[PDB]
Structures are given as structure tokens and as C-alpha cells.
Design a protein around this nucleic acid. Structure first.
Ligand code: SAM
Ligand code: ZN
Ligand code: ZN
Ligand code: ZN
Lengths: 109, 95, 98, 222, 86, 103, 82, 110, 97
DNA sequence: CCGGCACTGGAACAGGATGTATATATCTGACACGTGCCTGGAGACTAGGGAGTAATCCCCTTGGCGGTTAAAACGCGGGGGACAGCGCGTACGTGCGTTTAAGCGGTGCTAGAGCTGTCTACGACCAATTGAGCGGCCTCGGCACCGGGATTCTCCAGGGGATCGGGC
DNA sequence: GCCCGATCCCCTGGAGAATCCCGGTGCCGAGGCCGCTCAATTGGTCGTAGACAGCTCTAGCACCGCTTAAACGCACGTACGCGCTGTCCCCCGCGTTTTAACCGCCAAGGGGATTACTCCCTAGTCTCCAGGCACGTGTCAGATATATACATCCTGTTCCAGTGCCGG
């Protein structure tokens, strides 16, 4: 341990822990051996998928003139995009509600 | 007593401050993003496992991880994520 | 003559009041007394965490609210505007439960 | 006119002559019903019989109703009654002796099996000597029933625009056969007659000398 | 043994409670035979989940039902739920 | 001169109830093999060019396509009867698929 | 050598047979062009996954196990082919 | 080795291989260790479920004056049993067909 | 000839259990594949559920007590009541004799 | 027989009461920072086997040809079913007044979940040795078709007979 | 008045039929029989995972009292199911003629599938040390509570089109 310790997730330019994803892959009964560019690939996808469900909820909050995010903005952000609605199609979100929607035959003529 | 509970809160909070500098988040929502990340990790791992078993191999590699993403993610997500990963892996080696 | 709104107005204006809130729409004590009574058949003298009963109410309400949305399309198919006990059975049968 | 028309060789079934065979199938391509030992009449006349509704004859070895099932009427042959009475100018006709109900099995139509080319050369031969043939009936493709040389009493019928029976097609033991059924019940003493849609290759040379309101028509119009 | 049996607790889901659940689903007019059928539909859904929760609880040799038993019992049927741990 | 007689034809709905009984008892496949096999080879030419197939891999897609269609035509019928009809129209397939989940 | 016109090799009688095995008695006249659009979005979902499984293994032939895996992945298990 | 060999199916009283279930459990990535009465319990459960289906399939093949099971009798056996039909609900059996059933509003009426 | 390699199946145990129930019938070459798939498909559910039961509880061993819970979660009502008896008797007959 | 002092539904249109959106004030409880410390990640070697790469063998996917017959395409007709217009009467919605439990403060008691510490029985690892199970090769042998003698039943037949109109 | 040579309801020498029955030929699939090899049983040694026995101390169950928001009846009138009748046009059952799926061949070559040899990449041990977790604390965002100000739904009160049926 002569040189100064340089973290593995700074060599790649990421924010998620490449050193802990590896320990979880190894103790999880997935295979006998685990390569070296597997965690550097999985962290870079877990980080991209979460930086786009938040960029929509931050936009949805600005329409109520609010500063924080609550479980309702995540629902309004997920059920209004037809890709996240196809990925999260059988998931329930606590304290989320429904979308405003009413058929036309019921409206007064 | 009070041994430790690990989570992803401090990385979700670092990702938020790059897309929205003047914004916060509450506890009921941190506890939903946590379940989200834990749920997707385990759909992508348990399919690379099966691929390696079908092909009679003993090692999980980035070539299995890349293919387990095209079978799970729909449409344009599967085209942006595949380009995200192959830049981190290209930068990591040349160092 | 106390001004007597017409039939179908007060209903249409709470359809869109209950689609902006996110609260829970059943009483907590009546719902908690039924959970402890269903589960006397499988094992006696149980105890429940305080937040294990709050997790069941949410699943239940999310199940019913989405069964009613399937029931409401069969009625419009048959050219009605009311829902009857024969429109629930078609939804459940086509879904694949009964 | 006390004489008797040219005799016919009496017969009970159809005898093949032409170039087509019969289609008696094995007892694994025969349909099965849904009844069972039950109230009075199994496979009756007023019942929900899946073999009866679709114009099938049921077999006594395959029917679950057993052997007292009433869907066997092409073998028992409980035919109609009193024979030719004299008409006025129509040929011979017939008449009924016993009262008959509504929708009951009147006698079959039976003859010999001839195909298209043999039939047409037969008529082209019998035309040059002016026999005025009066006995032909097609059933399906490449098959014809004929009752000229031989047959039974159902060869003595007529045409009327107010008839009492029609010619249906039932499938008996893998083969298709013809049988005349009564539209509505009638007390005994009337001349049996049925409509037939002719398809003359030449032209219509006969008026309907029967007598009714709409019956004027022709022998080939409606 | 303060375990006086409970009885006739399904009639605690009153008809206003059901009219509100139907308003949130977008319904304008309601019949009068729906209230005795919604209860039979709910009492069949709750049993399939309480059975598996008690089965998960006995394997660990416990006496208290927790909030992870319910989440596992629900996920086992294709009804994942975010918000209560995991 | 000499005419031919013709027995009465069937009332509509009988030759269609004999086939419901004939086809619900066989087991064979109800589509033609070369027509079905050219469609599979033109669909796959948009994902990867110049590839081959196995005779028992083309025969496995045809067993699942028919099992999908025969089971969708059974949900269409119940909607048609709900609406008090006998005929199936193109707006019953859509209701079946929407309640089922696929659209 | 590209192809086309091949969706109309699923004729009208072949659809009436599949309707009779399902149990229907009358059929409208617009069902025939409505069914050829449903059958063509089910086949793509399966052939895409089969070709992905094939390309992972460095082959050029589509075997009969690729199809079984691509079908099981969608909850449509099939018995009798391996 | 010094004494004569006995299998492990013979000790338990089974017809299925208790020695071949064990290495499939050990080489399948299910855990780090495996007990000794896990394969002996998992074979006696795979034998019961096989007998349960073959009995009904034979009873259903008998009713055609046939002496041989084909894939149609396996379908007829399971689509009639209200529990094997719940265990095998999302499964296709090749060359099976369907069950005969006509609706009551389509049958001809006078 | 290159003496192709071997490949295992349950097609001699499936044909031993049939001679107990129906001592005179036979089975077809295409009806044998379906029973192969059946057994290989029911093995994996019961193994994969116990694999997770053991991980929820922080253990590293699969015993005859996780297989008795996987069965009670996977099988229906009256089916999951004779399988438990079968499996419980075939271990008592083995651990003593 | 269309025009006529006075006649009848139809059409519009503000104008109330009620419900929905504002602009300040106050104010509590949870979010966003700091500090100390323990455990989990990174740096440096070392020894063995899993996978990349080249080469040979033969199976099976593709391509063209002729020919026989069953299925698909096209055009007539006629009766049955889908869709629209009316009318009657039963049940669900809107509002008002009276009764019954859900909810919010506490308080006290104890059951049971979580942590710590020894200590023995159970599963992994390795070596020598024999039989259970898979691949290839013969037999028998229960069914589908073809003769065949051919047995109950049918039936064509010119004849055996009781009758007759005159014959005698 | 007796009787003669024809003269019509039975009648059986063949003959013939159909097909109950008993038995020759010829088969695609399944059932048994020896060589052979590699995977399961026997026998020991050992060290970590799990089973009991305390011991602290959080949280789930039980009771009491009060204030008010929600559930429960009860009546009226109005819109909406549900049955009936008439009409017309589209989907079903027929014949003809045209097209291409199926089946049996024969030929050439891509690529799937074993087998051998040699690096190089992942596991496994020691060290060292810094990033992430629990604990403690302050201040500010969002949740009510008033007061006023409009939008929104329903109807009374006017007002054109056409004129009720009288009538010369
Ligand atoms: C059907 S053949 C039967 C042979 C014989 N004439 C008979 O009646 O038994 C009767 C012939 O008489 C004619 N015919 C029968 N009934 C008729 C009728 N009602 N009107 C006109 N012609 C009729 C037909 O043209 C036919 O050619
Ligand atoms: Zn019957
Ligand atoms: Zn019968
Ligand atoms: Zn006439």
C-alpha cells in the first residue's frame, strides 16, 4: 500500500459504488466466477436509469410551484411516459393516486 | 447494538444535484427510489446467470451484461444504456 | 324552492374531486378488525406490527380502484351508463381469475 | 280407364349401377349425442337432440340412450298407408289412410344410382322415341337417383304450389339419403304432393294443372 | 386469554366507502346489487395473501407478523409494491 | 323436355354448426405450411441478414401462433354475447385485448 | 432478394377454420383485415428475442431451443419440443 | 470399498434417482451447502405427481377402445381436473386440441 | 461413425411408474417428451423457491425443512396435502434402516 | 280557401345563490449539516485451470424438376338479423334531520425480538473400485387389408292346380 | 243340365347375393439383448455453521374520557332501462373453373461439433487507511385560517314563427 488509494469509480467517472456492486455480485449465488468489467458496466446503467426518472419529477414539481419532491410527482412522471410505463407496468407506488381521466359519453350534452 | 443498514440514499442525492441544483427530496420518496434500484439490479443479474448456464460457462462478463440489457429494456432506453456502458468500460481500461 | 341541482351534476363534480387527492378511503378501525378475524383460521394468537396493516390497505384499494375501471368499459360496450353485477363477472372472467 | 300402369320391379334399397361407390365408414367417424337413459322419449320428436337438430341418424351401438332411442327411422320403415287412388288427369298420385302428425317420417325416395354422362346419354336416347320421362332427382355432385325402371310407391307423386311435404337430406351411416317429411298434420284422405325445382335443359312445356290461387305460375317459375 | 372471538366484520365496509372507491374509478351511476358483491370479491383477495404471510412467519419460528412478510407474499403473485422496505 | 328435381337446401346456420363439431375434435394444424413459412423468413430479414433455420424450429412457431389465435377468438365471443348479438365485429377484439392487458 | 405480399398468404378460409375451432357462428366482413394485423405483432416480439439468443452464441442458424427460451421469457411455456 | 453396494433409492423405497438429484442440486447455483435428506424428500414428491397424471391419462385412453397413450389423452386428463388445471394454467401442450363446448344461445330454437 | 456422446432423461423411470398403475398400456414416443418436460419444469420451481427462502433468513444450507415449505407455497389446496405425507414417510424409512 | 283579431308553443338572456380561487399571517416539525470512529475496500504477490484459437469430419439446409388432385377464387340468389324509433313505469339521486361510533389525548404492563458466548455434530474433500445406464442390432407379432368358400335369405321362374264361359 | 281347353293365385329348380365368418400377406412402430465406460458407493479426516442458554429493553395490547364528523333513515320526482314493431341490406349456402400446395427425386457445399495445446485472467492472503454510518442540532418550507372576489348552473320573463280553425 505504497501509493495513494484511488477509488475504482473515479477511474471510470461514475457516482455509484463499483467496489460494492462487486461484493454483491460475488455473495449472491449467480455464478462461480465474476469478471472485472462487469461491475463497471452495471453501475453505469443503474446510474443512467435513475437520472431520468428524476429529471421528469423535477419538472412535474415546478408546475405546483414547489421545491421538494413527494410520492405524487414520481407517479405523475412515470404514468405519462410510455417507456417507463412499459417497464414499471405491474408496480404499485404508495400514496400516488391516479391520473385525471373521464370518458366522453358521460359528459353533459 | 444498532449494527448498520446500508442504502443508496447518498448517491441518489448526488445524482439529483446535477439535474436540479435548487431542489430537495423527502423520506417517503427516498424510500421509493431505493426499492426501484434494488428491484432493477436483480432483474439484470438473474438473466446473465441463466445465459451463462445455457451456454455452459462459469464466468459472468460484460458481454453477458450487455445482452441481458437488450432483452429487458424497451425501445430507445436499450439503445442509450448500451452506449452509456461502453464508454465507462473504455475509459476504465486505459488507465 | 331550495334550488335543487339536477341529477348527474353533484356526481360528476366529485368524480373529479376524488381524482386529485391521494388519501385512503376506508375507516382504519373497521378495516383492522377484519384482518385479525380472517387470520384466526390459519394460526391462533398472532400479533401484527403497526405498519404491516398499513401495507394491506394500500394493496386492497389499488385492487378495487382498477377493477372498477374495467367494469366501466363493458357497460359502455353494452350501451348503458349504469354498472350491474353482471359486468364485474365479465371483467374477472376475461382477466383470467374466475 | 280400368287398366294398371306398367308394373315396376319393387325394391327396398338403392342398388349402384354407375361409376361411384358407397362411403360406409367405420364406427369411429360417426357422431355421438349427449342424451342418456332419461324421461319417456330419448331422441324423440320434441327433445334437444344434437344429432336430430343437425339432420343425423343415430346408431344403436354408439348412442348413449341405448337401444330404445327413437332416432332410427331409415331401417324400421314405419311407412305411410293406402295406395294409389285415381286422380282426374294427373297420373296416379296417392292418398293417406292413417292420421299423421306434424313433422313425421313419410316414406323414403329410392331407386338406382347413375352418374352425369350415363344419365345424359340415357335421356338423349329415350328422347328420340318420345317416352316422356318423368323420374329424375339429383342429390349432390356426381350422383343421381332414378325411379324409372324400378322404385317404390313414392314414384307416384305430383307437383303443387300448395304442397304438404318436402324433400330433405339426411346422413345415414356415413352416406346421404333423401326422405319426405310432412309440413303439417292432416286427417286422412288427401293426395300427397310436393314441390320440386326443375332445371330443364330445353324449355318448360307444361302448365301447373293443379288448381290454387298462386299456383298459376309454370312448372319452372315461382 | 383475552381472545373473545370476532364475528360479522365484513359489514364494516359500508356503502359510502364503496361509492367513493367507485367515484375514483370514474363511475357515474351505480346499481343496488353491487354492494353485496364487492364484499365477496374483497374477502377472496385478502385470504390468498394472509395465508402466505402466515406461512412465511411460521418458517422463521416467530409469533409476530412483520411488514416484509406481506411484501414477499405480494411479490410472489405479481403485485410488487414500492414504499414499505426492500 | 325432361327436367331434374332438387331437394331443399339447408337453412343457414346448420353447415356452420356441423363444423364447430368437426373442428373441436381433430388435432391437426389449420394453416398451410409454405405460405406460413415464407412470412417467417421475410419478417426476420429486418433484424439480421442471411441467416438459416431448422425444420423443427419453423414448426414450433406455428404451434404457438394458432394457440394464441384460437384463445383470443373465445374471448371475442363473450363480448359479442354480452352486447346481445350473434355476430362478432372488429370492436370486440379491441375490448378483449384492452381488458386482457395487451393494449 | 427482398420479399413482400406474404401476409396475404393467410387466406380467408384459414381464418374461418380458426374461428370455428374457437366456437363462433357468424363472422362480419371486416374481421379478416383486423386479424392479419394482430398476428403480425406477435411474431415480431418472438423472432427478435430468438435472433438475440442466436447471436449471443456466435451461430448463424436458428435452432429450436432459441424459440422455446424466447417463448418462456414471456410466460407462454411450450411442452414437446425439447 | 469392502462391502457390497446398495443404492439410495433402495433404502428409501423409491423408483427415481436419489443420487442423480443430488448433483443437480449441487451444480446449479442454489446455495453453498446441501443437506442429506433434501434429495430424498425431493424425489418422493416428483414421483407422486407423475403417478397422479398417468393414472388419469390411462383412464381417458381406455374410453376409446385404445391401448396406448397419445398427446390428446394427456390434454383431456388435465383440462378436466380442477387442480392440475390450476397448476398448469399457462402451459401449451403440442398436438392437444381443445375441449368440446358450445354456448347455449347458439343452439337452434323453434 | 464418431460414437456420439450420451444424453440423459427420465424415460426409464417414467416407464417403470406406468407398469404399477396400468400393467398393460404403453406410451408413445411423442408422449414421452411431454413428460420429460413436465418433470424438468417442476424440479426448477421447487428448487428456486427454497433457494430464496434460505436467503431471506441468512442461512447457507438447504435442508429437508425448506423443501417442505416450498411445496406448501407452490402446490394447490388438496394436492399439497398428500405430497407432504409422501415426502415425510420416505425420510423416516431411510434415516433408520 | 287563403287570409285574419287574436291565439299557441318555441327561443333567448340576463340574473341570482352557490361553489371555487385567491392574498396575508403564524408557526411547528422535519430536512440538511457537522463530528467521531470502526469496518470494509484498495495495493502487491503468487500459483493453477478456464477459455481463445487452429484444424478436420461429415450432417443437413438449400435448390431445381415433374405430376396429380384437393383447395381457393368468383359470381348468383334469398331469408334472417342488426339498427332505429316509441312508450311505459320502476329504481336511483338530491336534500334534510337524528343517532352512533371513529378518532385524539394519555397511562401503565409485560411479552417477545435481538445480541452475546460456548461447543459439538454434520457436510466438503480425496482416493480406489465396481455396476447401472445409454447406444446399436435382432426378433416376434398384433393389426389393417384381400381371398374364400358360402351360409341364411332372397328371388326369377315357367309350372302345379281350382275356375270359367260356353262346349256338349 | 255335366264337362273342356285354356286361364290366374300359389310354388320351388336353380341361382345368386352379401357379407356372418374364418383365415392368408404385409407392415411402420415399439420391445428385448449383449459390450462398454464413467459416474455413484465405501471409508476417513477436519473445521466451520448452527443449536441452546441467558439477558437487556422496545413496542404491541388494554383501558378511560370527550368532541365532533360521518353513517343512517325518509321522501319526492325524473331520467333511464327494457320491451315492441317495421325495414333493408349483408352474410350464408351453391356451382364452375383456375392455381399452386404436396410428394418424390437428385445434387452440391456451408457450417455445426469434437479434439489438442498454450497463455492469461480470476481467486486467495496480508497489510494499511479513509469513506460511510449513527448521533446531535437549528431554521425555514409548507400547512392551516380569514376575508374577499368572482365563475358556474338553473330558471322566470319576456318575445318571433306560425297561426286556432272561422269563415264568404
Ligand atoms: C312426377 S311424374 C309421376 C308419374 C305419373 N304421372 C304419376 O303421377 O304417378 C307426373 C307428371 O305429371 C306432371 N304433373 C304432376 N302433377 C302436376 C301438377 N300438379 N300440375 C301440372 N303437372 C303435373 C308432371 O309434369 C310430371 O311430368
Ligand atoms: Zn340423442
Ligand atoms: Zn339416439
Ligand atoms: Zn300449382
Amino acid at each position: 500500500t505504497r501509493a495513494k488509494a484511488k477509488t475504482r469509480s473515479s477511474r471510470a467517472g461514475l457516482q455509484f459504488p463499483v467496489g460494492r456492486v462487486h461484493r454483491l455480485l460475488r455473495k449472491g449465488n449467480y455464478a462461480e466466477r465474476v469478471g472485472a468489467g462487469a461491475p463497471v458496466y452495471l453501475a453505469a446503467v443503474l446510474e443512467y436509469l435513475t437520472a431520468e426518472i428524476l429529471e421528469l419529477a423535477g419538472n412535474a414539481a415546478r408546475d405546483n410551484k414547489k421545491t421538494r419532491i413527494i410520492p405524487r410527482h414520481l407517479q405523475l412522471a412515470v404514468r405519462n411516459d410510455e417507456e417507463l410505463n412499459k417497464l414499471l407496468g405491474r408496480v404499485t407506488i404508495a400514496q400516488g393516486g391516479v391520473l385525471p381521466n373521464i370518458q366522453s359519453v358521460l359528459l353533459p350534452k | 447494538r444498532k449494527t448498520r443498514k446500508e442504502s443508496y440514499a447518498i448517491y441518489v442525492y448526488k445524482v439529483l444535484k446535477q439535474v436540479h441544483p435548487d431542489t430537495g427530496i423527502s423520506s417517503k420518496a427516498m424510500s421509493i427510489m431505493n426499492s426501484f434500484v434494488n428491484d432493477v439490479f436483480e432483474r439484470i443479474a438473474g438473466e446473465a446467470s441463466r445465459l451463462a448456464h445455457y451456454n455452459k460457462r462459469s464466468t459472468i462478463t460484460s458481454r453477458e451484461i450487455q445482452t441481458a440489457v437488450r432483452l429487458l429494456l424497451p425501445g430507445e432506453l436499450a439503445k442509450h444504456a448500451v452506449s452509456e456502458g461502453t464508454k465507462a468500460v473504455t475509459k476504465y481500461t486505459s488507465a | 324552492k331550495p334550488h335543487r341541482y339536477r341529477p348527474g351534476t353533484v356526481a360528476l363534480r366529485e368524480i373529479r374531486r376524488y381524482q386529485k387527492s391521494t388519501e385512503l378511503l376506508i375507516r382504519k378501525l373497521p378495516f383492522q378488525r377484519l384482518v385479525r378475524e380472517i387470520a384466526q383460521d390459519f394460526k391462533t394468537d398472532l400479533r401484527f406490527q403497526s405498519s404491516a396493516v398499513l401495507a394491506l390497505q394500500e394493496a386492497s384499494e389499488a385492487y378495487l380502484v382498477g377493477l372498477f375501471e374495467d367494469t366501466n368499459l363493458c357497460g359502455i360496450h353494452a350501451k348503458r351508463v349504469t354498472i350491474l353485477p353482471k359486468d364485474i363477472q365479465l371483467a374477472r372472467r376475461i382477466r383470467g381469475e374466475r | 280407364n280400368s287398366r294398371k300402369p306398367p308394373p315396376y320391379k319393387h325394391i327396398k334399397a338403392n342398388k349402384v349401377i354407375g361409376k361411384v361407390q358407397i362411403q360406409v365408414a367405420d364406427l369411429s367417424e360417426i357422431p355421438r349425442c349427449n342424451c342418456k337413459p332419461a324421461d319417456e322419449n330419448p331422441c324423440g320428436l320434441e327433445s334437444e337432440c344434437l344429432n336430430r337438430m343437425l339432420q343425423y341418424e343415430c346408431h344403436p351401438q354408439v348412442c348413449p340412450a341405448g337401444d330404445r332411442c327413437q332416432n332410427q327411422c331409415f331401417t324400421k320403415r314405419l311407412y305411410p298407408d293406402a295406395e294409389i287412388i285415381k286422380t282426374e288427369r294427373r297420373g296416379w298420385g296417392l292418398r293417406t289412410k292413417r292420421s299423421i302428425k306434424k313433422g313425421e317420417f313419410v316414406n323414403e325416395y329410392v331407386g338406382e344410382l347413375i352418374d352425369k354422362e350415363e344419365c345424359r346419354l340415357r335421356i338423349k336416347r329415350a328422347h328420340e322415341n318420345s317416352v316422356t320421362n318423368f323420374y329424375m332427382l339429383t342429390v349432390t355432385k356426381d350422383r343421381i337417383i332414378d325411379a324409372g325402371p324400378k322404385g317404390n310407391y313414392s314414384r307416384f307423386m305430383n307437383h303443387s304450389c300448395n304442397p304438404n311435404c318436402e324433400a330433405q337430406k339426411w346422413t345415414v351411416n356415413g352416406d346421404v339419403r333423401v326422405g319426405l317429411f310432412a309440413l303439417c298434420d292432416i286427417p286422412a284422405g288427401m293426395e300427397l304432393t310436393f314441390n320440386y325445382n326443375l332445371d330443364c335443359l330445353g324449355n318448360g312445356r307444361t302448365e301447373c294443372h293443379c288448381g290454387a290461387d298462386n299456383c298459376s305460375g309454370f312448372l319452372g317459375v315461382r | 386469554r383475552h381472545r373473545k372471538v370476532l364475528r360479522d366484520n365484513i359489514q364494516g365496509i359500508t356503502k359510502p366507502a364503496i361509492r367513493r372507491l367507485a367515484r375514483r374509478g370514474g363511475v357515474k351511476r351505480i346499481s343496488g346489487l353491487i354492494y353485496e358483491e364487492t364484499r365477496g370479491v374483497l374477502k377472496v383477495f385478502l385470504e390468498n395473501v394472509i395465508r402466505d404471510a402466515v406461512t412465511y412467519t411460521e418458517h422463521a419460528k416467530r409469533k409476530t407478523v412483520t411488514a416484509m412478510d406481506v411484501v414477499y407474499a405480494l411479490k410472489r403473485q405479481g403485485r410488487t409494491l414500492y414504499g414499505f422496505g426492500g
